[PDB]
Amino acid sequence: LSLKTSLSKVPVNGQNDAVWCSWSGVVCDNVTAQVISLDLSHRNLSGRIPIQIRYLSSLLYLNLSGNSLEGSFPTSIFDLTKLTTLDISRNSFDSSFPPGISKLKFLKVFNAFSNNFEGLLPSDVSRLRFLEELNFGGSYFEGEIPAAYGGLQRLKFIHLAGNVLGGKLPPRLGLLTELQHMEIGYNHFNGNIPSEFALLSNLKYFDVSNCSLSGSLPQELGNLSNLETLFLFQNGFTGEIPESYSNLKSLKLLDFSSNQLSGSIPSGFSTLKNLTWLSLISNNLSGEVPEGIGELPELTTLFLWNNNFTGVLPHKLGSNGKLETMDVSNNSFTGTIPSSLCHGNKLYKLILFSNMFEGELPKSLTRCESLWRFRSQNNRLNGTIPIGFGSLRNLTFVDLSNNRFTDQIPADFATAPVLQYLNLSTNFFHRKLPENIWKAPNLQIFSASFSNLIGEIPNYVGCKSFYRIELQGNSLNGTIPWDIGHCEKLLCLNLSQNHLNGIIPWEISTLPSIADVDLSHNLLTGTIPSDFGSSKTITTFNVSYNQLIGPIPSGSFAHLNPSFFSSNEGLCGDLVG
Ligand SMILES: *[C@@H]1O[C@H](CO)[C@@H](O)[C@H](O)[C@H]1NC(C)=O
Ligand SMILES: *[C@@H]1O[C@H](CO)[C@@H](O)[C@H](O)[C@H]1NC(C)=O
Ligand SMILES: *[C@@H]1O[C@H](CO)[C@@H](O)[C@H](O)[C@H]1NC(C)=O
Ligand SMILES: *[C@@H]1O[C@H](CO)[C@@H](O)[C@H](O)[C@H]1NC(C)=O
């Protein structure tokens, strides 16, 4: 009986983003006892609730959410005694929440999420003993959780996240026999999680993250079966993960990231067969990862980075065919990379950098049809980078730098359809560049620096998307290709520390956006083409330690660092000619 359906020659036009108190005011004028539901949500309304609203004495349902209602909460609403659900969420109500909610003794649902309330949580609420859902999150509430809130049985949902609450969590809250959902993180709570919370047998969702809590993780919480979501991240928990937590048979999501947990991932975790998401990022965890974690049938997300895990990755990880994102960077992992990681073609993000992984890149990875971002720099991977990556049609980011790869660079990389980043630096190839590397349709950053490259730099035909090129610190001999002007997007070029002889390619002056150029430590000869001096993008031009000849250009080279030169010949920039 809302939206102006039942009248209740009078308008029932609910739109035209009008402010309010009298756009309705009228809508309560209709003395009506035939109005049981009032849904004025999302009408861009603004103003106050008028006192006259008390005459809708038959109201059961009132939704005023998603407007711009302001001022203190309207006490008049409390005179709506048959109110059963009340939604005032997503508004701009401020000041302390006034006492008097008690008269709404039939209230089952109170949602006031996202408002401007301040002061203390109303202790008043604890006398609504039909109440089931309570949402007071997203405001500026202060102080402690009133221990009397634990007197709310039938209550199955409580949300108080995103306030400025603090103190210690009231152990009495554990008496909430029917609580299924508890979301009270993003506050300033301190102290430990109460042992008593282990009595919340019906609890399916447990937050309390981004707080200031501490202590060991309370073992007793292993009693909380039925629990599907356990978020305790961004706190200050210490000690080990309790082995009792392997009894959480319903657990789907686990997040202990950004704490100070130590010890090992308990081997019982291998029995949590419903785990979807396991995140233990940025802790002081150690020891090995239980083999059984690679056989969890539903595991899709695996975050273990910034710990100090040792040992092998579980042989059969990924064999469930459901692994999507894995990040175990910043550890001390060893052994080979399991071949089963991308079984099912669901793996799209594979981040393994900063470990001690050895052996050959498993060739199965080249048939990972969903792979999108691959970062495995800083390891001990050996052998030849396998051929097949260029056939992955969504591979966009590859970092295999600082490894121990040898012989040839796979020629498919050149024909990878969407590859945007490719490093490969620091790697001991002792082979030529693939001769059609610069035809890569998409490739913005290519950095095979200090990778023991040899031979001539192939002709820059194509060079469509390149804007950063790093090939410094190799043994590239021959001449810098004279067709470098095909690289119209180029910004930074480093060919320093090679064996490049011959002239500086004039066609560099043709580049619209070239900014940083380093050709230092080579065997270059000839002039710096004076047309360089009319560039209005070149910021760095290090060409020092060469055999160049003639005057340095003027124009926009007159304000360059003289250090950029160290060949026998110059102009006023240092020693006149
Ligand atoms: C209030 O309205 C919004 C959108 O109109 C809806 O999603 C929400 O469930 C409503 N609240 C209640 C308690 O029914
Ligand atoms: C993770 O690496 C960061 C720097 O990348 C470092 O500050 C931190 O100490 C590392 N943590 C562990 C547990 O190795
Ligand atoms: C991590 O463990 C390995 C040896 O198992 C070693 O790097 C060191 O003991 C630990 N590193 C840090 C930073 O604690
Ligand atoms: C390529 O990798 C090296 C070492 O792994 C790193 O120092 C460098 O910054 C990387 N280059 C780019 C462009 O990311």
Ligand SMILES: *[C@@H]1O[C@H](CO)[C@@H](O)[C@H](O)[C@H]1NC(C)=O
């Ligand atoms: C340098 O280039 C010449 C081309 O004549 C080639 O014969 C020689 O092997 C190259 N140097 C190497 C590969 O070390």
